[PDB]
Structures are given as C-alpha cells and as structure tokens.
Symmetry: D2
Subunit: 387 residues, 4 copies
C-alpha cells in the first residue's frame, strides 16, 4: 500500500488555477452564481462554498490531510486544541449526561471538565483510566462519553484504549481520545476502537511552533457533521493562513516524528542511567508500568516525557542553565522545549487532582526536538554536572 | 482629547524593535528568563507572555484598539463573531439560569440560543425587544441576562437599549449587545448602560471581507477576565495574521463608516421612491418605526438594510441581474453585497421564529459598500427596469 | 469614482471566492507536455512559475494598469526595483540619460554610481526649466527621467512640455509619480512613456509592505520591462501583492483626506513665526504652482519646510507626540524626517547644493488623522 | 563541533518580546528615538534598523541562518534566485570587465549573461568549465569573474571548483558558485575557494514550493556590503512573510536533504538498470563523468537529475502518465517534480548554446522529493511499462 509520507505530500482534491501549492483563501464570504445555487448550498445540495465559518478551501485541505492519516469519515479544524476538545465533548454531552475522563489530563482540559461542564448540567468524574476496572466501577446508566489522554500530559500515564473501547461499544458510550502527545503517525485511536480522535495541532502535527490549532476526527459521518454543526455556533475556527501553515508543517510530519521518537528514547535512556535522575517517565522504556500496552497499541512514541530530580532546587538548576534546550511551555516543536509542570502547565490544577496525577516540584517535563541527539545530551550533561 | 481617527492610528503600546507597523507574532509559545519568572506569569506577575491562547501581542494590540473606541475596561478577540457571542453568554449563563433575547437575530445566533443553550439547562425566550414593557413581562426570578441586536439582522428592528439597561440594572441581569450592524463608530452600547458590547469583526470593523473574527468588550474588569477565562478553555482564538489584518483594516474604519452611512441613506431613499419597492427597512429613514430611538441612541447608521419586493420572481430578477453588486452573504465589506434572507442567512431558522421576525420570500437584504453612490443606484436602476 | 473600478477589478473569481486568493506558490502544474511547452512560447492561457507570473500579483498589476490608463503594469519588490527596471531595461552602453537634479536619495545613488559603471552617460539638470532640457541634449540621448513633485523639495517639472521634446527627438520619458499617486498624477496621459511608483508609500498606504510598480504606454515596452524583471529578479511577493491590492481599495478615499490635510498643515506652517519657507505645490506662493495646478488633478501630503536653524529643527522633531520621527512617506499616520542627515545623507556633496537641501529643512508626510490633532501637535512642539 | 541541525534550529540573536518563533516584521519603516540616533544609523553607527530595504529583522534572521551553514562573513536575501545572481555579478562587473561562465547554466542565467551583461559593456564567454585548461585558455587580462554551476542545471555536469578557485586566486578574479542544485548541506563553495556562494532559495532551502527567493553569501565583509549596496539600488528584496517561511522551511533542511540524497540515488539506480532508459545523468553514479570530482568536493548529492529516453514520444508518454510525480517546472520541492528541458526550462536558450549544452527532446529532468522511494519507483515503473 501507498506510504503515509506519499499520502500527506499528495492530498486528494483538484489544484486551483493549476497552482502546485494550495492557495490561501484569505476571504470571509463566497459569491453565488444564482439565488437558487445559493439556496441549494444552504440546503446541502450542490458543490461549492458559502462562508468561511461553514467551510474554507485551504482549511478543508488540512482537514483532508488529517482525515487521511486517522482513517476517519471526516475531520474538523479549529482555532486551538481546546477548540477541538470543547467541540468533541460539548457537541454531544448535554444536561443529565455523564462523562468519565482520565484523572491525568492537560491543565486546561481539567479546567474545562471540572469548571465549565458541571455548569452545563453535565456530570463529570476524573478516573484512573490505566485500570479498566476503575472505569467500569465509575460507569452509570447515564454514561455517554469516556475521554482519554494516552500517554497522559505530563506523566505519560498509559491507558488501555482498546479495552475501554469495548466497554464503550457494549454500553453505547462515545469514546474520545486526545492523541496530541504521540501524533497520528504513531497513535491512531480509531483503529483502537475510539469514536473520535483529536489533537492540538499547535504541537507535533504543525511542529514548527508558529500556530495555535486543533483538529478532531470522527469514525462516523453523523458525528463529524455534529462537530462541525457545533463549531458553526461555538466559533473556534482555524484561520486560512494558519491552515496553510499547518498543512505545510504536516508535509514533513512522518520524518520529524521518526527523529522525535529516536531522539526522545536516547535522551530518556541517558537520563535513566544518570546519577542525578531519580526516575524517568518515558512510555518506551521497559521500566515504565504502562510500556506493554503502549508498544502494543501504538506504532511508536512521542518525544515529550517527564522525569524526576532529587529536589526542586536541582530541577531549577537544570532548567535554567541549558544552552540548547529552551525554557518554555508547549511541546512537539522542531526545537527542544523544557518546562516545570508543578508551577507552570499544571499550576492551575487543584491540589485534590494534583496529588493523584501526581505532580511534584521535583518533576521536569522535556519535549525533545529534532536537533542532533548528542548535542541535546551534551547540553543536559553539562547542566547536570554544574558546580 | 484626540479624535477617533487619531486614536486608532496611534494605539497605546510600546514599539517592537522600533518597528512602525506592529509585528505579526506568528508564534505558539514564549520563552522564560527563569523558573520563577515563568511561575510568576501563571499567577500572574507581572509583565510578559506565556502562550498565544492566553495572550498574543499582535492580538492584544487589536483588542486595545477596540477597547479604546468602546470605552471598556478590556476587550477579547475571537476567531469569529460567533466565538464572541458564545463566550459572552456561556461564560456567565449556567444550568437553571434564564436568558431573554430579541426575536430577530442573526441565523446562527438563533441556532446557538435555540439548540445548544437549552441542552446546557439554560432557559431561553425569544421576545419582541422593541417594546420595553414586553421585556418586563417576560421576566422571571432566575433571569440573569438580556441579549440584543439593534438594529437587528436583517429587519433593522430597533431596541431601546438605554431603557432595557435600566431594567437589567434594577433586576440584577447583564445586558449584552450585538452592535455588528452599526459598528463602534456609531453605536457604543457601554455608553447606553450595557454591560457587554460585541461585534462580528468579519463585517465593518475589518471591512475588507478577507477575515473571520469577533470581539467582546466588557464594562467591568471582572467580566472581561471571566470572558477570557472562558476563551482559554473554549478555544475560539483570533490568529496572529488575522489580528494584524483586523487592526490594519480598523485604521480606515472611521472614514469607511462615514461613507457607508451616506451611501446607505441615499440608496435607501432611492429604493423608497421606486414604485417596484413596497417598503424599505432603514433605521435612518423618517418613515421607519423606531427611527427616533435609533436617532437618539446612535451617532450614525450602518449601510446594511432590508427592503420588500412585489413578489419572489421580482426579487429573483433583481438579485440575478446586477453588474456591480455581488450576490453573496455577509456584510460590512468595502464593496456592495446583496442577499436573500428567506433561503440564505435565515433559512435554518425555525419557521415558528421566522414568522415573528417578519421574514418573507419577497424580502431582499443589501449591504451598501464604499463605491460611488451613483454606480450602485445605476446598477439597481438597470436591474429594476427590465 | 475610481473607487468603484478598484473595488470591482477585471477578472474571474477563483472558486467563487469574494477576496482574491493569496497564491503563495512557486510553480504551477501542466496538463501535458504540449500545454506546458505552449505557455513557454506564449500560446494559450495559464501560469508557469511565479517569477514569470503570479495570479495574486497580476491582480494588483491590473488594478494599477486601470488607474494609470496603461497597456500593462509590472509589480516589483521595491520602488527601486521599479526604477532600475524602468531604466536599465532600455538604456545600454553608449546611451545618454537626462534626469532631474532633485531625486530620491537611492535614485541618485543608482544614476550616479551604477549607471555610469554600465557605460551609460548621466547628467543631472534642472528639469523645472524646459529650455535647460534642450541644452543638455546630446545625439545619443535615449531617455529623460522625471520626478515631480521631487523628493524632498517638491520641485515641479513641466511633464507635458518635456514629453513633446522627448517625442520629437526619439527618447523615452519615465516619470516617478510616487509623491502624488495615480489618483492625482497620471503621467501617461501627459505624454509620458513610463509611469512608476514606490507602492511602499501612498498606493499601499499602510506602511507594512515594500513594493514598486511600473506602467508602460505601449505593449512592447511593458513586455521589455517584464523581460528585464525576469532576469533582474525584483518581484512582489504574493502576500505583499494581497496587502497592496487591499490597501488600494481605500486609495482614492485616503488621497482625498491626505490632500486636504497636507494643505491645511502647510497653510498653518506658512503663517507660523518659526517657519521661513514652505515647499508645497498646492500653495500659490510656491514657484511651480501654475505647472502643478494644470498637470495634476490634486496634491499629495508630503512636503518640506525651512526652520531658522538646525537646533530649532532638532527641537521640533524630537518633541512631537502624534507625529513619528521616521523615514518613508504616504502612510495613514503622520511621519517626520530630516533630509540632510537621513534620506539624502548619501547624496554627493555637489548634488546636495544643486537640489537646495540644508540642515534647516524638515520634511513632513501628513497622514489621515484629524487635521486639528496634527496641527496641535506641531503647535505645541514649535512653542514649548 | 555542534551539528548543523542544532545550528539551524538555534540561530544566534536575541528573542523578540520573549517570543519563541521569530516575529514577522511586516513593516516598511522604523522609528527613531532622536534626530542624532537616526543620523547615526544612516552613517553606520549604532544599532540597528531604519527601513526594510536596508534591513528587515525577519529577513536578517534568515540571512543569519544561511551565513551559518556557508561559513560566510555575511549573507543577503533576495526576491528571487535571479535577484541573487544579478546582485552577485552586476555588483562587481562594469564595462570593460570580462566574465567566464559555464556553458551549461540555468535558462534565465543564460538570458542575463547573454542579453543583459553585453548591453552594459561587459564581455561574456560561455565556456566548458569541466575542463580547467579551457577556463585558463579563455582567460584575458581584463577577466574579473568566473561563474560556475555545479552540478549544472539540468545536465548535472560537474566542474572542478577547487581547481578553478586556484586560478581565480592567482589572477585576481572573484569565483562565484551557484549551489542551488546541491544545497549548503552538501556543497559549501567557500570551503572550496569560492568568493561567493549563492542559492535560489525557491528550491531546496525553502523546500516547500511556496516561496520564490534568493540568497548570496560572501567570504569577505566588503563583498557582502557591496552586494547589499547593489540590492538597495536594484531592489530585489525578500518579503518579511517570505523570509519567515524560508527560515521555517530551513529548520528541516538537513533531514530533507538526507532523504532527497538517498531517494535520488535509488531512483537513478532504478532508471539506469531499466531497459527503456538510455542514460542517467546523476553525479552520484559511478558511470557519470565527473563523479570523482563531485564525491571529493561535495558532502552529498541533490535529488534533481536528468535522464535520456529512446525518443521524444517515449519521454512524453512517461511524463504524462505519472500519478505521484507532478509535471511542472522548478525543483527541490518536498514532493517529486518532472519536466522537459528542451521545451520548458531551456526552451529560451539559443540553439548554438543548447547544442553545446547537449539538451535534446529525448531528455527528462526529475526532481525527487521525500516521498517513500518505493512509491516513487513504482510510479515510474508503471508509466514506463504502459501498453
Ligand atoms: C449565513 S452566514 C452569513 C453571516 C452574516 N452575519 C454574521 C453575523 C454574525 C456572525 O459573525 P461571524 O464572524 O461568526 O461570521 C454575528 N452577529 C451578527 C449580527 C451577524 O450578522 C450575514 O448575516 O450575512
Ligand atoms: C533612504 S530610505 C527613505 C525611503 C523613502 N523613499 C521613498 C521613495 C522611493 C523608495 O522606494 P522603495 O519602495 O524602493 O523604498 C522611491 N521613489 C521615490 C520618489 C520615493 O520618495 C523616503 O524618501 O523617505
Ligand atoms: C524556467 S522557470 C524554471 C525555474 C527553475 N530554475 C531554478 C533555478 C534558478 C532560478 O531562481 P529563481 O528563484 O529566480 O527562480 C537559479 N539558479 C539555478 C541553478 C536554478 O536551478 C527550473 O529550472 O526548474
Ligand atoms: C497551561 S497553558 C500552556 C500549556 C502547554 N500548551 C503545554 O501543554 O505544555
């Protein structure tokens, strides 16, 4: 079969005015041929565009590319990953519905789930999804959705997607997986039984750290139509320029991910053997609890992972004396990022959830870029071996 | 004090590397000097940036421009006017609360209020808000908000914002006003007593028809923080490039609006005197019901208005034989747009609500651009006399 | 209005898009070998490569082509890209060029340093006197280059008068109309052969893109220009072309307020005690007013004025709250500059005096702010 | 020694408002603090900006990146490769000066050298530069410059850059090398004795087929100042937006070139063993004349090469029946391009020069992208094996 590198470099669809690169449709509205042709496009009949919020050609191009790696019925682009998460949950969940979600999630996902959803009459439970039995125990007659991050931000906690999918399929609950950390190159949730696969495009998919974006993919046509229906009213849209950049960045995704995976594994192997390091939470290491599920359900690993220092001051010493790694939040960028979860990405997370995640000031999160691995390792080495 | 033209041309803020034009900050994340400096910003102390979703310098520049015209404590930019509307309502409204909204609104605003809000346990009533005592009768103990469009899409129906604001202040409810149609140049809702003033930037504020965006401005610092706290999780953001283009477009807004207003008035008066036109729904016309309310509360008028034809076939012939006007949805663009509400912008609106709005197959909506008035009038004259 | 023409340009919509798409592409696809071969030979419609032609860029070119009344227009990466392409495409070894003594700094740099390196004889003379153009004439004179009103002194030249001399003696007339814009100055309708602009200024008007455009009277001349651009390589970027076309949408409207603002400012400065001389082509005091009044349908907002001393000029320029100390002109906001030590600092010491540039001269570019706000900003700086 | 992947991902210079990605300075002019501060910057004193034509921060960031791989004193970015070629030649050559240039050059370079330079009183001779003795024989007392393309567009003809450099150094002539076909990753002319190394950034460096651009680098500070002095007058500038994209595209240059090189070699080796193909002109093959010079003087190979079919109609049949490869001009793009030199890129070159270059209607130029090589080979295979 045709390789994914070829698939991404050759998206389906006609060229516009014979242009090799797909044009940036920096426009708000579209022109109608006639009143009937305009009336029909609102009804759903005929091919063409109306208004960029409903559909934009360069945006739709990016959606097609994502839809093609995911193996979905359709994809929806968003202004942010949080736009994707809101439109993948609130498009389906309503007053009286129950949501089971992982206890270890991205900071703002926790914020959306614990603060905003309960205000909308939606029952939410944060559950350890590494254990399928805990997921079964939390299940209720009104359970409509299970939301998973695996490997989780930032602890790399592994969940049994395949096993949970079964329970979701038997009981009529929609399974949504956030696969941001791994990318659609190595994790394809819809193959594992999930109903909706989503990403923060801001991270690996774009990879260049210059755009905030989100994407959501559905196994079903009805489900993607509902997501786009919600997006129409909620209004989280990917800009034409941002879509152009994301598609462009995605052109090199497979090879970037290959280097990410290998760099990340080598950095983690180096850290785990280092005197100053207590523990390394990389899902590709044999020492890691959820390794056997991760290697079975994914075809590779992302390069973002967590590790434990002997103290906060030691962690502070490492982070502030690096010359290649740059101290900043976010991840999945071409260059290596480094961050302190306890006081940055997960400072807003309540300590009730903080303890069980479980994030301590000794922890450092690293997102290994595509720089020569030896340069990255040497940079960490000299910082770890300071006076 | 500076004039509106000068204020928008010289926005408050520092120059970046002595750059005359403000740089497009096409970035996702930002760097930290130290752990403490990064940890501080998340709290947040005191000056600096973290991540574009939380704050982007180019986006913030546009936000401050809108804040200066509205007379607000702060403004938040969005990826769409719908992003602004959702964030201006769902940030405050929760399960068990009650919203009163105008019966005539933009199509997707009707879609948002009728479909999605009741799913979140929010009570919504669509009420004729041109009558103030009708809002008082629709009131409940759990009423937390009133939402208004004045002039409303597409009928140009006018609401007494100042009068409704008094009711909202006395009874503990917020007043949110969609001022897309008139722009902040002519309509400043926060001066009329409203709590939140929002726009579809995609329309007049940008004015060049090349970007989708929204903005919301709050009277109090607490409300705008809550709005931005919602945007943080909801995720409707304005792209750095779009922020650059919106700010750029807003540079000529005052002079564009002045021409929009004058053009829209002459075109409406031309249509009113024409024998093939039943009625023209322009808020600046003496004949229009609620003209006096619009005259006192607004300093000018938008260029988007509705009018009635003899039949559907007559409307069809007009829209399909224009050479200058472009048949397309949207409004507030530099060139002239024309649209059919019944089967386009307000086609997804439930036929129950479409009846109360007064939207018929004979009605045509025009958005008069900044072309020469005589070119637009002549284009209409040619199409009408076939 | 010209506005209607600019808002509704010639051409077909792309996938029904209201705004013309940004063709951020390098190359284009072919249906077959024959179709691709044909386009390289000029047969059929379509595109090959962005340097040869870009749809977004061509859309801007056609907007300029309409207002200028040209056979064709070519966009460039800079005004200097337009200037050098409008001269070095025609001038060759052994040719002679007569150019105005007062030109933009880098246009002087081009003509004085680079042009004579290519075997092109260049003389800079006073083109405000038409009889002086006749005296500078040589048997090998192939081109006259003009700039009216000139940067920065606003020195007006009789374009139609010089055009007659050029036509009779077989020479091209190139006019830099940056200072006035195609709204008010249309050189091709005064008998000029080539009309060019620094789009960076009024045409774009938003001070966020560098670009140039050149419009030719004949189809052969623009083909020569585009043939030169193909090899020289000064191209307008697709994004920049998008921004320039977008900026052009408000051009006539911006120029109306530019003209009126610049006039009221100059009239204020002329009656002010601290100002010796004001060089605005719209003022009746200005020497070349009669020529400018008849040849142009309006005036730009960039002009020059004389202070008592350099210290007084420094005091004025460094205390403005609204106006900005910056080079460039034709922006929506008001810019201020000092020619002797900035724009015309590189201009040779002998051409410096022929132009009449002194350390006392201050150049202002009046934007589209409220007239009273800019006048008040100048008023407080000239007194406090 | 720090690897080039790391170098390109971590360019020197300060971050702007703590922004991770370098901002797009979409501006015309810059503000001054005082009259003297503005006067000094024109005089050359102080830091740093005045007007985008003289210097744009975004553009200078890209120039910095190119300067870093090249090992130059400075770099200048342009609106096109032809902008770079003109400014590297016409910035130094005046009437009475003599230029020696390769006989096999890019189409428009031939146009510039044949049509425009002679009009400026500059003597030009197109010479076979694969033979050092022919370069020596063509030499004159007024010879000021030698311009080389190696491997040449499109025949891939190899020139002895090192050997020609010596002659240039001994006789006081600048050596200028166009290294577009190979990229700075594999060919660094300044290490070989060239004075100026230039690229069409439109090709490999940007790599994404969305930007037209050029860059020129000099060994000497005076020379790059002269090039920039010409640029401000001639007017070929890189747009801030284009600069942003080129820097972005350059982030992944080393890894893209790794795949280009290996893909290109595998495609060439497949074509050479195929019965329909008469000859393959890839500089990395042992059969190719000048392979020994190429493998010594370069660190790798580009993926653009030319091959001979049995007929024009056979060439037509191949080019017009590909499903992955796209029929278009240009090269060095992320996806595979294909064109016909005799009727396309080199249809404008005079017949006396085209016969000298060896371009016949049987020839096909392929620019191998970063698609899975087996997919590329399979696409060519089915097109070659048609009924
Ligand atoms: C069907 S689609 C179309 C659209 C538009 N609008 C629109 C609007 C909106 C939205 O906005 P976006 O930005 O989101 O679009 C809001 N509001 C208001 C008042 C309005 O009118 C029209 O109507 O035409
Ligand atoms: C030294 S730098 C400076 C710049 C500006 N210029 C301007 C100009 C130009 C330039 O152009 P670009 O676009 O190339 O820049 C040209 N021409 C003309 C006539 C003019 O005034 C000024 O002057 O300020
Ligand atoms: C005819 S059109 C086509 C184009 C391309 N070129 C390319 C090139 C150039 C150009 O460059 P730009 O950027 O200007 O395009 C230069 N050089 C070199 C070496 C090369 O290969 C090809 O060939 O394909
Ligand atoms: C808490 S806002 C910044 C978080 C960032 N996107 C991360 O996951 O690293």
């Amino acid at each position: 079969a045709q390789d994914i590198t070829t698939t991404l470099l050759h998206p389906k669809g006609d060229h516009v005015l014979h242009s090799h690169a797909y044009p940036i449709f920096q426009t708000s509205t579209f022109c109608f041929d006639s009143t009937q042709q305009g009336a029909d496009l609102f009804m759903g009949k005929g091919e063409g565009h109306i208004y960029s919020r409903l559909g934009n050609p360069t945006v739709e191009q990016f959606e097609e590319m994502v839809c093609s790696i995911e193996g979905a019925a359709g994809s929806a682009a968003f202004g942010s990953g949080m736009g994707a998460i809101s439109s993948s949950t609130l498009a389906f969940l309503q007053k009286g519905d129950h949501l089971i979600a992982g206890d270890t999630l991205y900071g703002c996902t926790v914020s959306l789930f614990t603060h905003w959803l309960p205000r909308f009459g939606i029952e939410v439970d944060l559950i350890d999804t590494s254990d399928v039995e805990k997921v079964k125990a939390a299940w209720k007659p009104n359970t409509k959705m299970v939301y998973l991050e695996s490997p989780a931000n930032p602890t790399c906690k592994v969940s049994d997607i395949k096993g949970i999918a079964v329970v979701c399929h038997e009981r009529g609950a929609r399974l949504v997986v956030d696969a941001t950390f791994t990318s659609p190159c190595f994790l394809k949730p819809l193959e594992l039984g999930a109903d909706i696969a989503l990403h923060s495009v801001s991270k690996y998919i774009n990879g260049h750290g210059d755009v905030i974006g989100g994407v959501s993919s559905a196994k079903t046509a009805e489900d993607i139509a509902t997501i786009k229906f919600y997006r129409k009213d909620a209004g989280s849209l990917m800009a034409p320029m941002d879509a152009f950049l994301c598609a462009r960045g995605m052109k090199t995704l497979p090879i970037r991910m290959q280097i990410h995976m290998e760099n990340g594994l080598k950095v983690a192997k180096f850290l785990e053997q280092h005197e100053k390091i207590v523990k390394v939470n990389h899902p590709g290491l044999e020492s890691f609890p959820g390794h056997d599920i991760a290697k079975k359900q994914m075809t590779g690993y992302g390069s973002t992972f967590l590790f434990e220092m002997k103290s906060f001051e030691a962690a502070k010493k490492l982070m502030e004396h690096l010359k290649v790694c740059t101290l900043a939040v976010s991840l999945g960028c071409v260059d290596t990022l480094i961050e302190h979860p306890a006081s940055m990405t997960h400072a807003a997370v309540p300590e009730n959830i903080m303890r069980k995640q479980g994030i301590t000031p000794e922890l450092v999160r690293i997102s290994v870029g595509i720089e020569n691995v030896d340069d990255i390792i040497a940079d960490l080495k000299q910082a770890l071996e300071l006076w």
